[PDB]
């Protein structure tokens, strides 16, 4: 906890937090590519920083965030996190991907992974949300892209 206003922050302060992590994780990679913990945390942040970072960079950040988990999964296959992370990545990347097909394909992918995370502990509130999130994987994306500033609304009635 290197200093902090503690109130709301302009997000930046929070970005720095993730930054130091990314560097610590990324750097830790070469320091220990076996450390699935650092490999996983290296992703979690990527996803986080990806939020503040432009989608373009967010996407590329997610992609790598996935490949990162892969190696982590190699170190520890029981890493329900590395699995969920992979899912959380796809889910996020999907929202960034307009290609419903790809987005959906991803959303449905993160699902197959979530089943693993929960597998270890389905009592995990996090994994629960990750799973429940799939409930409207194709919808979240639709409403995600639909809800904003486009044009047409829809063609249906009550």
PDB file of C-alpha atoms in Angstrom:
ATOM      1  CA  UNK A   1       0.000   0.000   0.000  1.00  0.00           C
ATOM      2  CA  UNK A   2       2.369   2.678  -1.315  1.00  0.00           C
ATOM      3  CA  UNK A   3       0.460   5.782  -0.294  1.00  0.00           C
ATOM      4  CA  UNK A   4      -3.115   6.413  -1.364  1.00  0.00           C
ATOM      5  CA  UNK A   5      -5.818   9.041  -1.024  1.00  0.00           C
ATOM      6  CA  UNK A   6      -8.412   6.412  -0.192  1.00  0.00           C
ATOM      7  CA  UNK A   7     -11.751   7.920  -1.143  1.00  0.00           C
ATOM      8  CA  UNK A   8     -12.510   7.238  -4.788  1.00  0.00           C
ATOM      9  CA  UNK A   9      -9.412   7.919  -6.853  1.00  0.00           C
ATOM     10  CA  UNK A  10      -9.487   8.976 -10.486  1.00  0.00           C
ATOM     11  CA  UNK A  11      -8.929   5.362 -11.462  1.00  0.00           C
ATOM     12  CA  UNK A  12      -5.331   6.167 -12.314  1.00  0.00           C
ATOM     13  CA  UNK A  13      -4.182   5.456  -8.778  1.00  0.00           C
ATOM     14  CA  UNK A  14      -5.832   2.079  -9.226  1.00  0.00           C
ATOM     15  CA  UNK A  15      -4.158   1.697 -12.599  1.00  0.00           C
ATOM     16  CA  UNK A  16      -0.771   2.171 -10.980  1.00  0.00           C
ATOM     17  CA  UNK A  17      -1.582  -0.593  -8.525  1.00  0.00           C
ATOM     18  CA  UNK A  18      -2.266  -3.004 -11.361  1.00  0.00           C
ATOM     19  CA  UNK A  19       0.731  -1.634 -13.222  1.00  0.00           C
ATOM     20  CA  UNK A  20       3.232  -2.475 -10.509  1.00  0.00           C
ATOM     21  CA  UNK A  21       1.604  -5.892 -10.487  1.00  0.00           C
ATOM     22  CA  UNK A  22       1.784  -6.365 -14.238  1.00  0.00           C
ATOM     23  CA  UNK A  23       5.459  -5.458 -14.194  1.00  0.00           C
ATOM     24  CA  UNK A  24       6.030  -7.550 -11.091  1.00  0.00           C
ATOM     25  CA  UNK A  25       4.153 -10.414 -12.702  1.00  0.00           C
ATOM     26  CA  UNK A  26       5.486  -9.956 -16.215  1.00  0.00           C
ATOM     27  CA  UNK A  27       8.981  -9.418 -14.866  1.00  0.00           C
ATOM     28  CA  UNK A  28       8.481 -12.334 -12.505  1.00  0.00           C
ATOM     29  CA  UNK A  29       7.737 -14.387 -15.597  1.00  0.00           C
ATOM     30  CA  UNK A  30      11.352 -14.555 -16.710  1.00  0.00           C
ATOM     31  CA  UNK A  31      12.261 -14.705 -13.038  1.00  0.00           C
ATOM     32  CA  UNK A  32      10.127 -17.810 -12.678  1.00  0.00           C
ATOM     33  CA  UNK A  33       7.986 -19.024 -15.585  1.00  0.00           C
ATOM     34  CA  UNK A  34       7.020 -21.919 -13.348  1.00  0.00           C
ATOM     35  CA  UNK A  35       5.241 -19.669 -10.879  1.00  0.00           C
ATOM     36  CA  UNK A  36       1.665 -20.178 -12.008  1.00  0.00           C
ATOM     37  CA  UNK A  37       0.602 -17.803  -9.259  1.00  0.00           C
ATOM     38  CA  UNK A  38       2.527 -14.911 -10.760  1.00  0.00           C
ATOM     39  CA  UNK A  39       1.593 -16.164 -14.207  1.00  0.00           C
ATOM     40  CA  UNK A  40      -2.069 -16.091 -13.253  1.00  0.00           C
ATOM     41  CA  UNK A  41      -1.916 -12.798 -11.393  1.00  0.00           C
ATOM     42  CA  UNK A  42      -0.099 -11.482 -14.442  1.00  0.00           C
ATOM     43  CA  UNK A  43      -3.342 -12.057 -16.307  1.00  0.00           C
ATOM     44  CA  UNK A  44      -5.869 -10.941 -13.720  1.00  0.00           C
ATOM     45  CA  UNK A  45      -4.188  -7.553 -13.832  1.00  0.00           C
ATOM     46  CA  UNK A  46      -4.031  -7.568 -17.614  1.00  0.00           C
ATOM     47  CA  UNK A  47      -7.799  -7.924 -17.573  1.00  0.00           C
ATOM     48  CA  UNK A  48      -8.037  -5.158 -15.000  1.00  0.00           C
ATOM     49  CA  UNK A  49      -5.654  -2.780 -16.731  1.00  0.00           C
ATOM     50  CA  UNK A  50      -7.397  -3.817 -19.927  1.00  0.00           C
ATOM     51  CA  UNK A  51     -10.459  -2.065 -18.551  1.00  0.00           C
ATOM     52  CA  UNK A  52      -8.658   1.253 -18.282  1.00  0.00           C
ATOM     53  CA  UNK A  53      -6.576   0.606 -21.377  1.00  0.00           C
ATOM     54  CA  UNK A  54      -8.189   1.159 -24.756  1.00  0.00           C
ATOM     55  CA  UNK A  55     -10.123  -1.811 -26.084  1.00  0.00           C
ATOM     56  CA  UNK A  56      -7.524  -2.264 -28.797  1.00  0.00           C
ATOM     57  CA  UNK A  57      -4.888  -2.656 -26.108  1.00  0.00           C
ATOM     58  CA  UNK A  58      -7.465  -4.400 -23.951  1.00  0.00           C
ATOM     59  CA  UNK A  59      -7.988  -7.083 -26.569  1.00  0.00           C
ATOM     60  CA  UNK A  60      -4.293  -7.664 -27.150  1.00  0.00           C
ATOM     61  CA  UNK A  61      -3.909  -7.598 -23.385  1.00  0.00           C
ATOM     62  CA  UNK A  62      -6.570 -10.261 -22.990  1.00  0.00           C
ATOM     63  CA  UNK A  63      -5.193 -12.517 -25.701  1.00  0.00           C
ATOM     64  CA  UNK A  64      -1.831 -12.593 -23.964  1.00  0.00           C
ATOM     65  CA  UNK A  65      -3.600 -12.781 -20.623  1.00  0.00           C
ATOM     66  CA  UNK A  66      -4.958 -16.093 -21.851  1.00  0.00           C
ATOM     67  CA  UNK A  67      -1.729 -17.569 -23.163  1.00  0.00           C
ATOM     68  CA  UNK A  68      -0.303 -16.560 -19.806  1.00  0.00           C
ATOM     69  CA  UNK A  69      -2.869 -18.638 -17.954  1.00  0.00           C
ATOM     70  CA  UNK A  70      -2.124 -21.590 -20.203  1.00  0.00           C
ATOM     71  CA  UNK A  71       1.420 -21.815 -18.896  1.00  0.00           C
ATOM     72  CA  UNK A  72       0.076 -21.319 -15.393  1.00  0.00           C
ATOM     73  CA  UNK A  73      -2.350 -24.173 -15.931  1.00  0.00           C
ATOM     74  CA  UNK A  74       0.669 -26.243 -16.895  1.00  0.00           C
ATOM     75  CA  UNK A  75       2.293 -25.496 -13.558  1.00  0.00           C
ATOM     76  CA  UNK A  76      -0.949 -26.048 -11.684  1.00  0.00           C
ATOM     77  CA  UNK A  77      -3.935 -27.624 -13.448  1.00  0.00           C
ATOM     78  CA  UNK A  78      -5.891 -27.313 -10.223  1.00  0.00           C
ATOM     79  CA  UNK A  79      -5.565 -23.567 -10.650  1.00  0.00           C
ATOM     80  CA  UNK A  80      -9.311 -23.041 -10.778  1.00  0.00           C
ATOM     81  CA  UNK A  81      -8.338 -19.397 -11.092  1.00  0.00           C
ATOM     82  CA  UNK A  82      -6.199 -19.840 -14.182  1.00  0.00           C
ATOM     83  CA  UNK A  83      -9.253 -21.544 -15.629  1.00  0.00           C
ATOM     84  CA  UNK A  84     -11.745 -18.923 -14.516  1.00  0.00           C
ATOM     85  CA  UNK A  85      -9.284 -16.234 -15.536  1.00  0.00           C
ATOM     86  CA  UNK A  86      -9.144 -17.751 -19.001  1.00  0.00           C
ATOM     87  CA  UNK A  87     -12.924 -17.579 -18.962  1.00  0.00           C
ATOM     88  CA  UNK A  88     -13.031 -14.077 -17.527  1.00  0.00           C
ATOM     89  CA  UNK A  89     -10.635 -13.104 -20.291  1.00  0.00           C
ATOM     90  CA  UNK A  90     -12.741 -14.496 -23.111  1.00  0.00           C
ATOM     91  CA  UNK A  91     -15.883 -13.041 -21.586  1.00  0.00           C
ATOM     92  CA  UNK A  92     -14.253  -9.629 -21.436  1.00  0.00           C
ATOM     93  CA  UNK A  93     -12.619  -9.936 -24.837  1.00  0.00           C
ATOM     94  CA  UNK A  94     -16.010 -10.928 -26.195  1.00  0.00           C
ATOM     95  CA  UNK A  95     -17.557  -7.659 -25.078  1.00  0.00           C
ATOM     96  CA  UNK A  96     -14.745  -6.041 -27.027  1.00  0.00           C
ATOM     97  CA  UNK A  97     -15.359  -8.315 -29.989  1.00  0.00           C
ATOM     98  CA  UNK A  98     -18.288  -7.278 -32.195  1.00  0.00           C
ATOM     99  CA  UNK A  99     -18.095 -10.563 -34.067  1.00  0.00           C
ATOM    100  CA  UNK A 100     -21.092 -12.069 -32.314  1.00  0.00           C
ATOM    101  CA  UNK A 101     -19.875 -15.416 -33.594  1.00  0.00           C
ATOM    102  CA  UNK A 102     -16.429 -14.993 -32.087  1.00  0.00           C
ATOM    103  CA  UNK A 103     -17.764 -13.138 -29.070  1.00  0.00           C
ATOM    104  CA  UNK A 104     -20.369 -15.818 -28.472  1.00  0.00           C
ATOM    105  CA  UNK A 105     -17.907 -18.577 -29.286  1.00  0.00           C
ATOM    106  CA  UNK A 106     -15.728 -17.052 -26.593  1.00  0.00           C
ATOM    107  CA  UNK A 107     -18.544 -16.500 -24.125  1.00  0.00           C
ATOM    108  CA  UNK A 108     -19.522 -20.130 -24.565  1.00  0.00           C
ATOM    109  CA  UNK A 109     -15.854 -20.970 -24.159  1.00  0.00           C
ATOM    110  CA  UNK A 110     -15.370 -19.221 -20.837  1.00  0.00           C
ATOM    111  CA  UNK A 111     -18.298 -21.377 -19.784  1.00  0.00           C
ATOM    112  CA  UNK A 112     -16.548 -24.675 -20.408  1.00  0.00           C
ATOM    113  CA  UNK A 113     -13.811 -23.225 -18.232  1.00  0.00           C
ATOM    114  CA  UNK A 114     -16.055 -21.887 -15.492  1.00  0.00           C
ATOM    115  CA  UNK A 115     -17.390 -25.399 -15.035  1.00  0.00           C
ATOM    116  CA  UNK A 116     -13.859 -26.296 -14.010  1.00  0.00           C
ATOM    117  CA  UNK A 117     -13.385 -23.391 -11.629  1.00  0.00           C
ATOM    118  CA  UNK A 118     -16.648 -24.124  -9.856  1.00  0.00           C
ATOM    119  CA  UNK A 119     -15.774 -27.800 -10.063  1.00  0.00           C
ATOM    120  CA  UNK A 120     -13.079 -27.225  -7.469  1.00  0.00           C
ATOM    121  CA  UNK A 121     -15.352 -24.948  -5.476  1.00  0.00           C
ATOM    122  CA  UNK A 122     -18.810 -24.115  -6.842  1.00  0.00           C
ATOM    123  CA  UNK A 123     -19.432 -22.334  -3.560  1.00  0.00           C
ATOM    124  CA  UNK A 124     -17.155 -19.586  -4.820  1.00  0.00           C
ATOM    125  CA  UNK A 125     -19.187 -16.412  -5.169  1.00  0.00           C
ATOM    126  CA  UNK A 126     -16.759 -15.325  -7.862  1.00  0.00           C
ATOM    127  CA  UNK A 127     -17.022 -18.492  -9.918  1.00  0.00           C
ATOM    128  CA  UNK A 128     -20.765 -18.261  -9.413  1.00  0.00           C
ATOM    129  CA  UNK A 129     -20.914 -14.830 -11.003  1.00  0.00           C
ATOM    130  CA  UNK A 130     -18.572 -16.000 -13.738  1.00  0.00           C
ATOM    131  CA  UNK A 131     -20.933 -18.880 -14.416  1.00  0.00           C
ATOM    132  CA  UNK A 132     -24.152 -16.933 -14.002  1.00  0.00           C
ATOM    133  CA  UNK A 133     -22.558 -14.354 -16.269  1.00  0.00           C
ATOM    134  CA  UNK A 134     -22.787 -16.893 -19.067  1.00  0.00           C
ATOM    135  CA  UNK A 135     -26.529 -17.065 -18.525  1.00  0.00           C
ATOM    136  CA  UNK A 136     -26.614 -13.909 -20.613  1.00  0.00           C
ATOM    137  CA  UNK A 137     -23.325 -14.321 -22.439  1.00  0.00           C
ATOM    138  CA  UNK A 138     -24.952 -13.705 -25.828  1.00  0.00           C
ATOM    139  CA  UNK A 139     -27.315 -11.205 -24.251  1.00  0.00           C
ATOM    140  CA  UNK A 140     -24.744  -9.272 -22.256  1.00  0.00           C
ATOM    141  CA  UNK A 141     -22.924  -8.765 -25.536  1.00  0.00           C
ATOM    142  CA  UNK A 142     -26.117  -7.815 -27.331  1.00  0.00           C
ATOM    143  CA  UNK A 143     -27.184  -5.463 -24.563  1.00  0.00           C
ATOM    144  CA  UNK A 144     -23.566  -4.410 -24.204  1.00  0.00           C
ATOM    145  CA  UNK A 145     -23.309  -3.282 -27.808  1.00  0.00           C
ATOM    146  CA  UNK A 146     -27.010  -2.548 -28.095  1.00  0.00           C
ATOM    147  CA  UNK A 147     -26.964  -0.317 -25.037  1.00  0.00           C
ATOM    148  CA  UNK A 148     -24.885   2.699 -25.989  1.00  0.00           C
ATOM    149  CA  UNK A 149     -25.194   4.860 -29.080  1.00  0.00           C
ATOM    150  CA  UNK A 150     -26.158   3.084 -32.281  1.00  0.00           C
ATOM    151  CA  UNK A 151     -29.374   3.464 -34.240  1.00  0.00           C
ATOM    152  CA  UNK A 152     -32.273   1.081 -34.732  1.00  0.00           C
ATOM    153  CA  UNK A 153     -33.839  -0.291 -31.571  1.00  0.00           C
ATOM    154  CA  UNK A 154     -35.536  -3.554 -32.462  1.00  0.00           C
ATOM    155  CA  UNK A 155     -38.393  -5.167 -34.350  1.00  0.00           C
ATOM    156  CA  UNK A 156     -40.791  -6.717 -31.866  1.00  0.00           C
ATOM    157  CA  UNK A 157     -43.666  -5.996 -29.513  1.00  0.00           C
ATOM    158  CA  UNK A 158     -44.568  -6.666 -25.899  1.00  0.00           C
TER     159      UNK A 158
END
